[PDB]
Write a protein that binds this DNA or RNA. Structure first.
Ligand SMILES: [Cl-]
Ligand SMILES: [Cl-]
Ligand SMILES: [Cl-]
Ligand SMILES: [K+]
Ligand SMILES: [Mg+2]
Ligand SMILES: [Mg+2]
Ligand SMILES: [Mg+2]
Ligand SMILES: [Mg+2]
Ligand SMILES: [Mg+2]
Ligand SMILES: [Mg+2]
Ligand SMILES: [Mg+2]
Ligand SMILES: [Mg+2]
Ligand SMILES: [Mg+2]
Ligand SMILES: [Mg+2]
Ligand SMILES: [Mg+2]
Ligand SMILES: [Mg+2]
Ligand SMILES: [Mg+2]
Ligand SMILES: [Mg+2]
Ligand SMILES: [Mg+2]
Ligand SMILES: [Mg+2]
Ligand SMILES: [Mg+2]
Ligand SMILES: [Mg+2]
Ligand SMILES: [Mg+2]
Ligand SMILES: [Mg+2]
Ligand SMILES: [Mg+2]
Ligand SMILES: [Mg+2]
Ligand SMILES: [Mg+2]
Ligand SMILES: [Mg+2]
Ligand SMILES: [Mg+2]
Ligand SMILES: [Mg+2]
Ligand SMILES: [Mg+2]
Ligand SMILES: [Mg+2]
Ligand SMILES: [Mg+2]
Ligand SMILES: [Mg+2]
Ligand SMILES: [Mg+2]
Ligand SMILES: [Mg+2]
Ligand SMILES: [Mg+2]
Ligand code: NA
Ligand code: NA
Ligand code: NA
Ligand code: NA
Ligand code: NA
Ligand code: NA
Ligand code: NA
Ligand code: NA
Ligand code: NA
Ligand code: NA
Ligand code: NA
Ligand code: NA
Ligand code: NA
Ligand code: NA
Ligand code: NA
Ligand SMILES: [Sr+2]
Ligand SMILES: [Sr+2]
Ligand SMILES: [Sr+2]
Ligand SMILES: [Sr+2]
Ligand SMILES: [Sr+2]
Ligand SMILES: [Sr+2]
Ligand SMILES: [Sr+2]
Ligand SMILES: [Sr+2]
Ligand SMILES: [Sr+2]
Ligand SMILES: [Sr+2]
Ligand SMILES: [Sr+2]
Ligand SMILES: [Sr+2]
Ligand SMILES: [Sr+2]
Ligand SMILES: [Sr+2]
Ligand SMILES: [Sr+2]
Ligand SMILES: [Sr+2]
Ligand SMILES: [Sr+2]
Ligand SMILES: [Sr+2]
Ligand SMILES: [Sr+2]
Ligand SMILES: [Sr+2]
Ligand SMILES: [Sr+2]
Ligand SMILES: [Sr+2]
Ligand SMILES: [Sr+2]
Ligand SMILES: [Sr+2]
Ligand SMILES: [Sr+2]
Ligand SMILES: [Sr+2]
Ligand SMILES: [Sr+2]
Ligand SMILES: [Sr+2]
Ligand SMILES: [Sr+2]
Ligand SMILES: [Sr+2]
Ligand SMILES: [Sr+2]
Ligand SMILES: [Sr+2]
Ligand SMILES: [Sr+2]
Ligand SMILES: [Sr+2]
Ligand SMILES: [Sr+2]
Ligand SMILES: [Sr+2]
Ligand SMILES: [Sr+2]
Ligand SMILES: [Sr+2]
Ligand SMILES: [Sr+2]
Ligand SMILES: [Sr+2]
Ligand SMILES: [Sr+2]
Ligand SMILES: [Sr+2]
Ligand SMILES: [Sr+2]
Ligand SMILES: [Sr+2]
Ligand SMILES: [Sr+2]
Ligand SMILES: [Sr+2]
Ligand SMILES: [Sr+2]
Ligand SMILES: [Sr+2]
Lengths: 237, 73, 56
RNA sequence: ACGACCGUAUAGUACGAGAGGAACUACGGUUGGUGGCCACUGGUGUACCGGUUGUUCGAGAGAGCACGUGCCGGGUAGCCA
RNA sequence: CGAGUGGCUUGCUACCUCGAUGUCGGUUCCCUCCAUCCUGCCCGUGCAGAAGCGGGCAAGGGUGAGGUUGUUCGCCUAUUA
RNA sequence: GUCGGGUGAGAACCCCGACGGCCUAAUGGAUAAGGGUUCCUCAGCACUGCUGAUCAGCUGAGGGUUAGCCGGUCCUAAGUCAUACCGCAACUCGACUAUGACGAAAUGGGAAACGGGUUAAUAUUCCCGUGCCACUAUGCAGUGAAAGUUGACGCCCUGGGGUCGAUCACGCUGGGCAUCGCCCAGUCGAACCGUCCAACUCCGUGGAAGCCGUAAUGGCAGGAAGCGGACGAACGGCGGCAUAGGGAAACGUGAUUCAACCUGGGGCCCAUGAAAAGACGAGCAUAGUGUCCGUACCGAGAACCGACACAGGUGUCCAUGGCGGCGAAAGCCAAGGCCUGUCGGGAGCAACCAACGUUAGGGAAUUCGGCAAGUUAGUCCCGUACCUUCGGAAGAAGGGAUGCCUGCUCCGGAACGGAGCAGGUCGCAGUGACUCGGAAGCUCGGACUGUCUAGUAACAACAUAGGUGACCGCAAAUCCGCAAGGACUCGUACGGUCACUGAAUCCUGCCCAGUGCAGGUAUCUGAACACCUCGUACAAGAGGACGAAGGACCUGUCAACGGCGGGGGUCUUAAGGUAGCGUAGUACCUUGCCGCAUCAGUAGCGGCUUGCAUGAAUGGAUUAACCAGAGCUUCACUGUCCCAACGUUGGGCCCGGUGAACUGUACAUUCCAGUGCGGAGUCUGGAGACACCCAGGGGGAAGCGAAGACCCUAUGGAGCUUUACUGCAGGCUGUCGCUGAGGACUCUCACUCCGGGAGGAGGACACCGAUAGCCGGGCA
RNA sequence: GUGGAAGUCUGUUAGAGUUGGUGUCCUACAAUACCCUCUCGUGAUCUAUGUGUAGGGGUGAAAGGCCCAUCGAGUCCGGCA
């Protein structure tokens, strides 16, 4: 047959690329020598094209102007801190070790100094649970208990823009506009609606996959479609 | 409200749009001062026409349930 | 719109031009590569054994 | 190049208890087909005459254009049913 | 039960045609056949009449309009000799 | 087009005049691409030109494009290339990372030029007048100099300022018309220099507890109005420019509406609307320099692409010329262009055809089907059902009005803006042309806008929001590459990948036996290396022990593939069809039966329904709105029909000129029968038949056009499928090498990852090389 | 009353498209044209130029559509007689 859409994606051609030349910045935490003697002031709030959420421009003492992953409740004029001794307040960044248990945080680093990997989407947040000298236990947005190096930095509070998902797109045109700001091919043609040559589910007088949808983890690309290695399907049981 | 949607989309879709936008455009109490002059400027961006305080909040509400949690703990 | 005559009217783009190296009107001014002599692609001159009968 | 039918007189007669109910023949008409003709009726009639909208020729008069008449009314010859 | 005629139905065969002879129904227009539906002329009757029913000669002329359905066929309606 | 005339050997079509017409977002003006001399002049007509030709985009010969300030050139955009580094057997191949360069001629950013005159052909380029920019030099001034500002930005609504244009009023100059007194044109004048400043922002004063303000939102004791002030606009006003220029002349003045341009206010985003060079910041005089490339012409019913002087295709701006009207609509008319959407002459001009006008009475009878045609129509007033997601349905439906003239009222600052009143009055007809909906009901489908088979399918198909399931914590899931590497990703579960269903509403039953996926697993089975035995002086080889994934086996799972029958009052093979719907776009039987409607209804609708063979996200039911989607009915209307007629324009016919193609074994004036490979102009028998030509509609030549697409055959081809055969990628898993120290363990030193770094995390694992088992239409 | 939303309505505004005529044409004006009717026309809109994706590969709101009059695997030359 012909390569399926999922395979065309990988070549990274324009149709599948994100409009990076239009993106603003990668909200990674600032790098501090130590001391925590680094503070800045929120100079403005902006829209982040890549995440459909707001971001805050901060001017730091040492003259560095950078965009930051803003939690809810950060406004212009406010002063933020980044360091071990940073004050424990919304919008401030410091290593999990310094963060008091039971405090919601976002933009959590995976490995100390990486800049932040977890809980960055609209209105989300990780929940710092257990402390220790060897491991900090955080509960990520998906509900998974994650063991992290207490040296991993994080921002106090939940991410701005919460509830974005509560409003329906209502029309195709709205979906359209959002999709144009992401690395995605949209709209979506169902596999069952294509010719046999174009997809494992194509072909047949009437539409229907001529096979079970749960595909094995070991299936090669081109064949791994439908419900990948599902542990189960449906709503029952 | 969803009246601009005419007889399209159906109840639910345009019922939520109405409510969400109804609460979205209400006068909101500014965290800076105390006046009900906060208006949305864009997605998750709010500002007070009185004192000019520009800040981040929910997408359609200036404060979200989870956002109000942080304060506590 | 037919793929024939009506679609031929839209053709006013310049692609292949006289090549600096070989003189043939084969220098693709958008790719900056000569489809005839290889100029812009290779220092060596474009050549292939299939340009003639195998035993000749 | 003519085919067929209806109706009237025959006759409420013949026949028949009655009910019902013919024919020969002489008439008038209709229908289908056929050939021709325009006095009559009807159609057409971008000959013609009139009314009138927009615009241009300054107005008036008189005209052009609005598709092979802008639109509307009447209609001779001729051709037609 | 027996003997036939036709070549309108269907089946059979594979003779002609695969370097192509374009389908069904309808329409339009022309010619024909008779195994006659009407019209002409007859014979019989379980033929009074009127009318039926059956039969004979006869192909001059006629055999129309509509409802469903692509339908052919057919079912249905009002007319009709 | 026509009448005159000009030139010429020759004139329907070359030129002049008159008369008559055509084009108005174009048939006019300027241009991009592309073409390339097609541009201008002279001389020509063999060639090219739908006829002719004295003409020309043709032929011969000459000539023509002038720049500091118009483009290029400079900047950077998506993105491209080169070099280095790395991969590759290798390269002209290949991703990343550095560096460098390249990448915008109408239409991104950008130092500076206007007006007039001149040529056969150039012209913000030459010439005249005036002006401006950059750099450099000299001089005076200046110590400031880099912070900031600009370049620099989306979509929708709107106020204010304001030029051109257009129009109104009055004057002046010139023209036209001649029953009046009207009608037309002109009434000019730049860049630049100088000056003015509304809006926004801010300051002083002031002191509002209800006032201020808008088209609207709004503003205020955190200080409203009012008053004063700072900063501050136009491609605009004003003055100079200008006894410049231009005009035969006059060489105006005010106003309204106001494109350009300037400046504000509001609203929207699950969408956020470039960058860089440069400029400003940062004075003035005088002088010098400002090179290089482009510059003609066409820009299209003859200069481009389409083989053509092709009815096609092909970007930008002129979007403000007059009447009209809501209008960038129609129709008519200017400026400007044209008679080249380039063969003519003749016949009341026949048949026939294209496109069209008018048809009495009947009115869909026509037809598969109102196909085609028609009906309605603009604006105002009255009035408007079922149903509904309360938006809508709706312009439902239905009814009435509509011109002109005279004099007025109201709104507004006013319009050459709008809404009305009274009286008078004409026509068959007042949206008089033009422009300009026919309406209503029932059913099926898809919710909707949207998409599609360039070139026979626009739909019920695809998409969609909405619903749902699956995978994945990021050193991830999914995907591309042989590799070096890469997309997703300036992304992180409110994410994004993989699938299914397809708005809302009410709902979504039973089945895990088979197949798929996943989890588990005592025991069973399960490869290679190492290990043990036999064998071999060794090796081949035979056997053993251990046993990973996988399978057996167990479990979970159907919004996973799919399934929901036959029999009896269970059987196969798990269950045995629940809500609903039902003769369906699914019902063979079938024109099912009852009813409605019709004169008559295989149709349509309602009901029944045992459903050959409906049924729940293989979604069921239902549904307002929507629809060039399928079917049915009604009102209105009509040449669709009864049944055809007359007319109009272009052909057709005759004449001048020009001038192809298809097709052709031969013969050929045929007709009726027969015969023949059974479908003969040609054979046989008869019949008929004097030759030639014109027009016609097409019966025959099994007419012409295409080595039948249907069907079969070939140990033909290709695309597609799968539990066909055989293999190959890929994933999982064991083993060996990388690989180190002390059947479970610690460590650090290779190696990996994070970190700017120190250092941290991990760690002999993982990655990678090799091999073995399993899966493996992803691929051959 | 104001306000002016909308994948909102009418609309040959520009611009885009193409339901029916199974009209015209069918050695064409044209190897996809012409006319009338019809649909869209503030947005998932239309449009110019530049730029990127390449052949078992692209691209595809999916029609096996499209990738220079050709696509159920482009074109050219070669393998090849
Ligand atoms: Cl999304
Ligand atoms: Cl230029
Ligand atoms: Cl305003
Ligand atoms: K055949
Ligand atoms: Mg970031
Ligand atoms: Mg995109
Ligand atoms: Mg889909
Ligand atoms: Mg399909
Ligand atoms: Mg497949
Ligand atoms: Mg479906
Ligand atoms: Mg045979
Ligand atoms: Mg034939
Ligand atoms: Mg007989
Ligand atoms: Mg009798
Ligand atoms: Mg006869
Ligand atoms: Mg010129
Ligand atoms: Mg021509
Ligand atoms: Mg009539
Ligand atoms: Mg009939
Ligand atoms: Mg019609
Ligand atoms: Mg007034
Ligand atoms: Mg139906
Ligand atoms: Mg639809
Ligand atoms: Mg097509
Ligand atoms: Mg359509
Ligand atoms: Mg969905
Ligand atoms: Mg979803
Ligand atoms: Mg669908
Ligand atoms: Mg029925
Ligand atoms: Mg189910
Ligand atoms: Mg399905
Ligand atoms: Mg053949
Ligand atoms: Mg076949
Ligand atoms: Mg094959
Ligand atoms: Mg790294
Ligand atoms: Mg295969
Ligand atoms: Mg493009
Ligand atoms: Na007879
Ligand atoms: Na019938
Ligand atoms: Na000025
Ligand atoms: Na006007
Ligand atoms: Na001519
Ligand atoms: Na629409
Ligand atoms: Na099962
Ligand atoms: Na079923
Ligand atoms: Na539609
Ligand atoms: Na007619
Ligand atoms: Na013939
Ligand atoms: Na094939
Ligand atoms: Na209101
Ligand atoms: Na059409
Ligand atoms: Na190929
Ligand atoms: Sr990052
Ligand atoms: Sr980083
Ligand atoms: Sr299928
Ligand atoms: Sr269930
Ligand atoms: Sr065309
Ligand atoms: Sr082009
Ligand atoms: Sr190159
Ligand atoms: Sr070579
Ligand atoms: Sr009688
Ligand atoms: Sr009697
Ligand atoms: Sr006329
Ligand atoms: Sr009319
Ligand atoms: Sr033949
Ligand atoms: Sr006989
Ligand atoms: Sr008889
Ligand atoms: Sr038959
Ligand atoms: Sr039948
Ligand atoms: Sr001559
Ligand atoms: Sr010329
Ligand atoms: Sr450049
Ligand atoms: Sr430019
Ligand atoms: Sr715009
Ligand atoms: Sr104004
Ligand atoms: Sr020029
Ligand atoms: Sr032009
Ligand atoms: Sr054209
Ligand atoms: Sr003129
Ligand atoms: Sr000519
Ligand atoms: Sr008349
Ligand atoms: Sr009918
Ligand atoms: Sr009928
Ligand atoms: Sr009315
Ligand atoms: Sr299309
Ligand atoms: Sr079509
Ligand atoms: Sr639904
Ligand atoms: Sr199972
Ligand atoms: Sr049931
Ligand atoms: Sr449905
Ligand atoms: Sr003979
Ligand atoms: Sr003929
Ligand atoms: Sr619309
Ligand atoms: Sr429209
Ligand atoms: Sr058709
Ligand atoms: Sr027509
Ligand atoms: Sr054709
Ligand atoms: Sr509009
Ligand atoms: Sr093609
Ligand atoms: Sr060959």
């Amino acid at each position: 047959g012909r390569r399926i859409q999922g395979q065309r994606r990988g070549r990274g051609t324009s149709t599948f690329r994100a409009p990076s030349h239009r993106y603003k910045a990668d909200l990674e935490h600032r790098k501090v020598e130590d001391g925590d003697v680094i503070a800045g002031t929120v100079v403005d709030i902006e829209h982040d094209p890549a995440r459909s959420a707001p971001v805050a421009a901060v001017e730091f003492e040492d003259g560095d102007r950078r965009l930051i992953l803003a939690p809810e409740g950060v406004g212009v004029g406010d002063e933020l801190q980044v360091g071990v001794s940073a004050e424990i307040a919304p919008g401030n960044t410091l290593p999990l070790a310094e963060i008091p248990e039971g405090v919601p945080v976002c933009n959590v680093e995976s490995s100390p100094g990486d800049g932040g990997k977890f809980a960055r989407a609209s209105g989300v947040n990780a929940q710092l649970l257990t402390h220790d000298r060897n491991v900090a236990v955080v509960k990520l947005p998906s509900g998974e208990m994650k063991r992290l190096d207490p040296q991993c930095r994080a921002t106090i509070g939940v991410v701005a823009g919460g509830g974005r998902t509560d409003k329906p797109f209502v029309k195709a045109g709205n979906k359209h506009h959002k999709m144009k700001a992401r690395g995605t091919k949209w709209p979506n043609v169902r596999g069952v609606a294509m010719n046999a040559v174009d997809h494992p589910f194509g072909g047949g007088g009437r539409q229907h996959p001529g096979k079970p949808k749960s595909i094995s983890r070991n299936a090669p690309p081109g064949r791994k479609v439908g419900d990948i290695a599902s542990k189960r399907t449906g709503r029952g049981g | 409200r969803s009246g601009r949607f005419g007889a399209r989309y159906g109840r639910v879709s345009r019922r939520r749009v109405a409510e969400i936008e109804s609460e979205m455009n209400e006068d909101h109490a500014c965290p800076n001062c105390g006046e009900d002059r906060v208006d949305r400027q864009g997605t998750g961006i709010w500002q007070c026409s009185y004192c000019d305080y520009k800040f981040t909040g929910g997408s359609y509400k200036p404060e979200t349930p989870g956002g109000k949690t942080v304060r506590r703990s | 719109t037919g793929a024939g005559t009506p679609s031929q009217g839209k053709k006013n783009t310049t692609t292949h031009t006289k090549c600096r190296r070989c003189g043939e009107k084969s220098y693709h001014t958008k790719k900056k590569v000569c489809s005839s002599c290889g100029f812009g692609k290779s220092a060596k001159r474009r050549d292939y054994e299939w340009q003639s009968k195998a035993g000749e």
